[PDB]
Amino acid sequence: PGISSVIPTVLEQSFDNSSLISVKELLLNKDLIHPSILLLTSHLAHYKIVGSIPRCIAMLEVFQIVIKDYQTPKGTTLSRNLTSYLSHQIDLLKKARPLSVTMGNAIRWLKQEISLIDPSTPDKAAKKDLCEKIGQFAKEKIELADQLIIDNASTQIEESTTIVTYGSSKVLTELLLHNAISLKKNIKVIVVDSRPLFEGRKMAETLRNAGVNVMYALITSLDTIFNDVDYVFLGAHSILSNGFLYSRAGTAMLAMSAKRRNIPVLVCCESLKFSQRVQLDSVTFNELADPNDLVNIDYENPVERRGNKGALLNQFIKERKFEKKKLAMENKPKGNKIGGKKGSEGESKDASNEE
Amino acid sequence: SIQAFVFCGKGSNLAPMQHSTRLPKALLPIGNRPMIEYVLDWCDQADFKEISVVAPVDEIELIESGLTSFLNSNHSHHLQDPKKINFISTGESLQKELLPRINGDFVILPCDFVTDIPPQVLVDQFRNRDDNNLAMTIYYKNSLKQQQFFTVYSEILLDVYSQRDVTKTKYLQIRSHLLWNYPNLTVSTKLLNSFIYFCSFELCQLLKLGPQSMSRQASFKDPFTGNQQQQNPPTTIFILPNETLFIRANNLNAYMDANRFVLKIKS
Amino acid sequence: EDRLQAVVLTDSYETRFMPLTAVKPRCLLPLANVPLIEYTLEFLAKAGVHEVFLICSSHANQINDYIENSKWNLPWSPFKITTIMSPEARCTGDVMRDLDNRGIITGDFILVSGDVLTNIDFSKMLEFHKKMHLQDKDHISTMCLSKASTYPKTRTIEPAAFVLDKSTSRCIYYQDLPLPSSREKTSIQIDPELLDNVDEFVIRNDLIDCRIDICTSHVPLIFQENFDYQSLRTDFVKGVISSDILGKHIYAYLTDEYAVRVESWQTYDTISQDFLGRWCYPLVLDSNIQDDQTYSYESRHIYKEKDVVLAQSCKIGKCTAIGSGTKIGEGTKIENSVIGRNCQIGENIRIKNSFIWDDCIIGNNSIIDHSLIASNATLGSNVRLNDGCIIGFNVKIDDNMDLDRNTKISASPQDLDDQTLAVSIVGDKGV
Amino acid sequence: TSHCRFYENKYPEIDDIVMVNVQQIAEMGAYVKLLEYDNIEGMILLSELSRRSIQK
């Protein structure tokens, strides 16, 4: 199977809902694992760019590739060990890093597809139509959905607007690009970034590469830029069946600020991002990473410096724990643009029954 | 997807052992442990399944015998003998010959090796950083004149210039276009090349059409130049070589270094 | 370490700033409302100089007057300023020779060439220098180096090359190349004499020029001995290296902090931009070093002094500065520009990356895109300018004018286009 | 320039079949250009289009 247990850093007295560590350096691997999965795992382990949306697409692509490479054996049938393989892959993924609802949905869809086609049809003809179908699905629930979202944004966003964004959600970046080049509008895009992740920075860079006026913002200096700000979009990850946004980093604070100061908050989301599972706080299900990211002085990601920090077990009780994903409130984000055009966050799972 | 090529030849540079008809360059006892033992260990560590060893005109079955008897191996090793070898041509002519057998990425590792460094981290680096070529340099012997020069970068870690002091003009010369793009260029004197080479998927096209390489160094990493004129057809990721430094005492054998290696081995 | 003396080289790179320097000199000019020598003076004060030597030649009287007006002639300061007289347009060697002939120096002395604005704490550097001196007898000068901004692609004027050491830090070779403006040369030659004695080599080209030297009592003697030298950076250090006196060594030092010298227009602009941003930490306008200044930092990177009049309905951009006593009417779309003290403004100016110096009167309707306006020069009606335009001293721009890229405007009331008097390139008038 | 009818006449008849390439959707239904009879737009209302995921 690989490597299990034996990890640095304590279990911690505060916040221990999920397991904290997993394979990063490859040693003794099974002689049946597809390299693309391994590469993906390697990437995710230390990624800066992707967040929720592109990850799922990547996964889908990988799956497609696997299917293309797969052929029906003489002894075992098409539906004999494929499911087992999928399960193994899932387990590997989980071991690497906790997964999203979209991925789960995709898995479910795949499972359904497996059941649908009966093991009697010609093998070459089977996968030919399968990969086409999967492509079609991808086009529909992602690209077309993105387009729909863009169009929704278009009718709502006024002439000459100031937008404040967080994270590295691809859809928002696409929207901003559209605003810049295709429609041609006056845009002021303020992007906020945190210590361990340089997603905001990346977004800013991307904007620059197009030709947009960008203000770089931080958590320490928030109130100075608001007091002027008209419209705020948040980096969406998943909407729960209560009306709460399970999202990345200090978006909740921003939302609170928005609520305090005049204008309501807006959220752009996909039709398949919705979850039937329910939770109402950050303590419920936390996504964790290694405290090794916050040791060095900032500036850039790879530095390797000698200074003062570099003790987790050496000094007299030192805990340096952080959270990657937090909870955003219910009443504060009201706007939701999805595959079913219009709706609010109070409307929690009306689209879930409609599918 | 994963494969390695093992280079073998004949001892010409060495003075005292190699001129014997029965003793090959691959199978040599230097310090108790055999020469190809270390290489085999490295390969095992690297988790490569299909490894094909290229052989010279001299010794056709001895190498096979070595592979078979005495040594743990537990791997499907194939020993092949191409015809176009003249020596006056080390391995480039072999490389040119064997190209349809390559399915993915290939690693070049000669028969002569003295190794102590961690093997996985080179491979991992090659995989991750999105680069076509990677090479290694190690410190000179510190235990109690004209040598060789190599270029290094420190932050990404890149290689640019690699030419030796054998045949060149009296004054050292640098190009203008090669300096303006990538501004920082650290030149070291102490570092010695261990001749470890990593190759990506897109390398097979150039060898069959236009051969210019000599001793696997002349036209291998230096024709990365996308400057001044651009008159050579590239394969697409831009052509960039890389280099990494290591501390441990492990180097190449060519001159009177064998006797030093003997001294080293016993510790 | 106590009691130090310093020599500052002022007025050296004239005609390089071609549109200006006709009545008023080069060093006296302000960066953002405040002169370039002031920063140098501040730095000197920080260091702890007790005797200041300053060189003046062209437009020297005005410089002297300025010095007199500055708060250093009064006996409260540990240092006093003495002026060195020299003929118009000279090399740095002659001045050095003159200084040697005069004879004042006892021990360590600081020689600063050009105009340098720096924020580095120098006591540590001094200590290091002392320590290195204590190592071996035959040692001369200390050099400063800093890491370049991103990549040297916009910096075409300065192509400074350095060959360095890790263990003891010593320079070897210097080279300059054009490249993107003119593609001609592809060859650089390096000395093969000393290699195995040093072992470690770090060759770097991405380094900002500073031209600051901390020197011992050897340099003037050396200059006296060999009178073939003209400049300190190009010929001298290299000469010293290439077996001039056997056993003598020089220092190199690296600092990550901001230190850039002024020589060209684009570089100056870049420096100004940097200043506008929060790159400099000890050198911010809100602290007010001159005491007469009353600047305060505000939101959206806007600098403002006390008492500024501005009319209703106006939009502002990023990285801007507004001086005191400015009477501004309706309009002003201000983006990335410095405006001097006391400026009367009519109506509507579209500003994109512009620059305005002290005391300027702008009339009605002007679209300005990336250009500089000098002191006491007035703008009339209908002014439109392109990228990289420089306007000289006392230029009275009247009615209706259009100019394109790289158009230079004269300062003298001699060789360049656009005259100071009535109408520029629509009716040739003047001397 | 690309225009003109495919068969004989510009206007289609009764019970005949036509192929359509859809550009934009969701307002009335689909009022899009034809490939079997000329380039003049033909419309479907949001009821006759569905036989048995409707938007996707």
In chain B, the number of structural domains is 1
Nearest residue of chain A to residue D25 (CA atoms)? A148
Partner-chain contact C205 B188, CB within 8 Å: no
The residue type found at C358 is: D
Domain residues for A317? 149-355
Q: Which helix (H) or strand (E) holds B53?
A: strand B50-54
Closest partner CB to B171 (pick from C179, C190, C206)? C190
Q: Which helix (H) or strand (E) holds B262?
A: helix B258-265
Distance, in Å, from the CA atom of A167 to the CA atom of A235, rounded to the nearest integer, reads 6
Are C257 and C145 in contact by the 8 Å Cβ rule? The answer is no
The residue type found at B49 is: K
Partner-chain contact C190 B176, CB within 8 Å: no
Q: Is A88 within the bounds of a domain?
A: yes
Distance, in Å, from the CA atom of A27 to the CA atom of A44, rounded to the nearest integer, reads 18
Angle (nearest 5°) at CA C116 between C112 and C121: 85
Q: Is A1 within the bounds of a domain?
A: no
Are A172 and A187 in contact by the 8 Å Cβ rule? The answer is no
Residues in chain A whose Cβ is within 8 Å of chain B: 25-29, 31, 35, 39, 42, 302
Task: Name the domain boundary from A121, A148, A175.
Answer: A148
Distance, in Å, from the CA atom of C328 to the CA atom of C308, rounded to the nearest integer, reads 8
Task: Name the domain boundary from A105, A123, A148.
Answer: A148
* Residue C325, Cβ density class (10 Å: 0-12 exposed, 13-18 middle, ≥19 buried): middle
Which token pair is B19? 């001129």
SS3 B246: strand
CA C7 to chain centre: 16
Other C-beta atoms lying within 10 Å of the C-beta of residue A33:
15
Angle between helices A35-45 and A82-96 (to 10 degrees): 20
What is the DSSP-derived secondary structure letter of residue B130? T
Q: What is the dihedral of CA C40, C41, C42, C48, to 10 degrees?
A: 110
Domain residues for B231? 1-267
Closest to C259 measured CA to CA, from C119, C162, C113, C155: C119
- Dihedral over Cα of C190, C191, C196, C201: its sign: negative
* Residue C412, Cβ density class (10 Å: 0-12 exposed, 13-18 middle, ≥19 buried): middle
- The answer to whether A160 contacts chain C (CB < 8 Å) is no
The 3 state secondary structure assigned to chain A is CCCCCCCCCCCCCCCCCCCCCCCCCCCCCCCCCCHHHHHHHHHHHCCCCCCCHHHHHHHHHHHHHHHHHCCCCCCCCCCCCHHHHHHHHHHHHHHHCCCCHHHHHHHHHHHHHHHHCCCCCCHHHHHHHHHHHHHHHHHHHHHHHHHHHHHHHHHHCCCCEEEEEECCCHHHHHHHHHHHCCCCCCEEEEEEECCCCCHHHHHHHHHHHHCCEEEEEECCCCHHHHCCCCEEEECCCEECCCCCEEEECCCHHHHHHHHHCCCCEEEECCCCCCCCCCCCCCCCCCCCCCHHHHCCCCCCCCCCCCCCCCCCCCCCCCCCCCCCEEEECCCCEEEEEECCEEEECCCCCHHHHHC
Closest to C27 measured CA to CA, from C5, C55, C68, C69: C55
Q: Which residues pair with D30 in a beta bridge?
A: D44
Q: Is A3 within the bounds of a domain?
A: no
Contacts of A44 in chain B (CB under 8 A): none
- The answer to whether C318 contacts chain A (CB < 8 Å) is yes
Q: Which helix (H) or strand (E) holds B31?
A: strand B29-31
Cβ-based neighbours of C257, under 8 Å, separated by 6 or more: C118, C119, C120, C146
Are B22 and B62 in contact by the 8 Å Cβ rule? The answer is yes
What is the DSSP-derived secondary structure letter of residue B12? -
Task: Name the domain boundary from A114, A148, A182.
Answer: A148
Q: Which residues pair with A325 in a beta bridge?
A: A248
Distance, in Å, from the CA atom of B241 to the CA atom of A238, rounded to the nearest integer, reads 42
**What resolution does the deposited structure have, in angstroms?**
9.4
What is the DSSP-derived secondary structure letter of residue B40? H
Closest partner CB to B145 (pick from C179, C189, C196)? C196
Residues A134 and A154 in one domain: no
Q: Which residue has tokens 């003047």?
A: C430
Distance, in Å, from the CA atom of A336 to the CA atom of A236, rounded to the nearest integer, reads 10
- The answer to whether C194 contacts chain B (CB < 8 Å) is no
Plot region of A246 (φ>0 → left; ψ -120 to 50 → alpha; else → beta): beta
Closest to B189 measured CA to CA, from A343, C166, C62, C347: C166
Cβ-based neighbours of B207, under 8 Å, separated by 6 or more: B95, B96, B99, B213
Residues A189 and A71 in one domain: no
Q: Is A4 within the bounds of a domain?
A: no
- Check chain C for breaks (C–N over 2.5 Å) and list the residue before each, or none: 413
Residues A252 and A324 in one domain: yes
Cβ-based neighbours of A292, under 8 Å, separated by 6 or more: none
The 3 state secondary structure assigned to chain C is CCCCEEEEECCCCCCCCCCCCCCCCCCCCEEECEEHHHHHHHHHHHHCCCEEEEEECCCHHHHHHHHHHCCCCCCCCCCCEEEEECCCCCCHHHHHHHHHHHCCCCCCEEEEECCEEECCCCHHHHHHHHHHHHHCCCEEEEEEEEECCCCCCCCCCCCCCEEECCCCCCCCCCCCCCCCCCCCCCCCEECCCCCCCCCCCEEECCEECCCEEEECCCHHHHHHHCCCCCCHHHHHHHHHHCCCCCCCEEEEEECCCCEEECCCHHHHHHHHHHHHCCCCCCCCCCCCCCCCCCEEECCCCEEEECCCEECCCEEECCCEEECCCCEECCEEEECCCEECCCCEEEEEEEEECCEECCCCEEEEEEEEECEEECCCCEEEEEEEECCCEEECCCCEEEEEEECCCCCECCCCCCCCCCCCCCCCCCCCCCC
- The answer to whether C124 contacts chain A (CB < 8 Å) is no
Q: Is A2 within the bounds of a domain?
A: no
Distance, in Å, from the CA atom of B246 to the CA atom of B244, rounded to the nearest integer, reads 7
Phi, psi dihedral angles at C131 (to 5 degrees)? -60, -45
Q: What is the dihedral of CA C421, C423, C426, C427, to 10 degrees?
A: -50
- Dihedral over Cα of A338, A343, A347, A351: its sign: negative
Contacts of residues A74-81 at CB distance under 8 Å and 24 or more positions apart, as own/partner, are A77/A119, A78/A119, A78/A123, A78/A126, A79/A114, A79/A119
Are A and B close enough to touch, i.e. 3+ CB pairs under 8 angstroms? yes
What is the DSSP-derived secondary structure letter of residue B218? T
User: 192-221 in C: which are within 8 Å (CB) of A?
Assistant: none
Mutate one of C147, C318, C333 to test the A interface: name it (highest A CB count within 10 A).
Answer: C318
Residues A302 and A348 in one domain: yes
Which token pair is C3? 């009691």
Residues A102 and A195 in one domain: no
Other C-beta atoms lying within 10 Å of the C-beta of residue C406:
10
In chain A, the number of structural domains is 2
> Which regions of B69-195 does DSSP assign to beta strands (E)?
77-80, 105-110, 133-138, 150-152, 172-173, 186-188, 192-193
- Dihedral over Cα of C283, C287, C291, C296: its sign: positive
* Residue A190, Cβ density class (10 Å: 0-12 exposed, 13-18 middle, ≥19 buried): buried
Distance, in Å, from the CA atom of A134 to the CA atom of A129, rounded to the nearest integer, reads 9
Contacts of B47 in chain A (CB under 8 A): 26, 28-29
Which token pair is C339? 């405006």
Angle between helices A170-180 and A145-156 (to 10 degrees): 50
What is the DSSP-derived secondary structure letter of residue D34? B
- Dihedral over Cα of C239, C240, C242, C244: its sign: positive
What is the DSSP-derived secondary structure letter of residue B41? H
Are B151 and B161 in contact by the 8 Å Cβ rule? The answer is yes
Contacts of D56 in chain A (CB under 8 A): 140-141, 144
Are B121 and B204 in contact by the 8 Å Cβ rule? The answer is no
Please state the length of chain B: 267
C-alpha distances (whole Å) from C411 to each of B87, C355, C385, C431 are 74, 17, 18, 11
Partner-chain contact A42 B128, CB within 8 Å: yes
Closest to C47 measured CA to CA, from C13, C8, C102: C8
Q: Which helix (H) or strand (E) holds B121?
A: helix B120-128
Distance, in Å, from the CA atom of A239 to the CA atom of A274, rounded to the nearest integer, reads 5
> What is the β-pairing status of strands C338-339 and C320-322?
parallel
C-alpha distances (whole Å) from C75 to each of C48, C81, C178 are 15, 11, 49
SS3 B199: strand
CB pairs under 8 A between B and C: 55
Distance, in Å, from the CA atom of D19 to the CA atom of D9, rounded to the nearest integer, reads 16
- Check chain B for breaks (C–N over 2.5 Å) and list the residue before each, or none: 16, 71, 88, 144, 155, 236
What is the DSSP-derived secondary structure letter of residue B125? H
Residues A173 and A258 in one domain: yes
Partner-chain contact B128 A25, CB within 8 Å: no
- b/e D23-53 (16+ beta carbons within 10 angstroms → b): eeeeeeebbbebeebbeeeeeeeeeeeeeee
Residues A207 and A348 in one domain: yes
Q: Which chains touch A (3 or more CB pairs under 8 A)?
A: B, C, D
Q: Which residue has tokens 């002026």?
A: C83
Q: Is A6 within the bounds of a domain?
A: no
User: 118-177 in B: which are within 8 Å (CB) of A?
Assistant: 120-121, 124, 127-128, 155
What is the DSSP-derived secondary structure letter of residue B67? H
Residues A224 and A298 in one domain: yes
CA C170 to chain centre: 26
Are A274 and A101 in contact by the 8 Å Cβ rule? The answer is yes
Are B and D close enough to touch, i.e. 3+ CB pairs under 8 angstroms? no
Alpha-helical (H) ranges within B129-249 are 177-180, 204-209
Distance, in Å, from the CA atom of C201 to the CA atom of C193, rounded to the nearest integer, reads 14
Longest CA–CA span in chain C (Å) reads 72
Distance, in Å, from the CA atom of A322 to the CA atom of A15, rounded to the nearest integer, reads 10
Partner-chain contact C299 A224, CB within 8 Å: yes
CB pairs under 8 A between A and D: 6
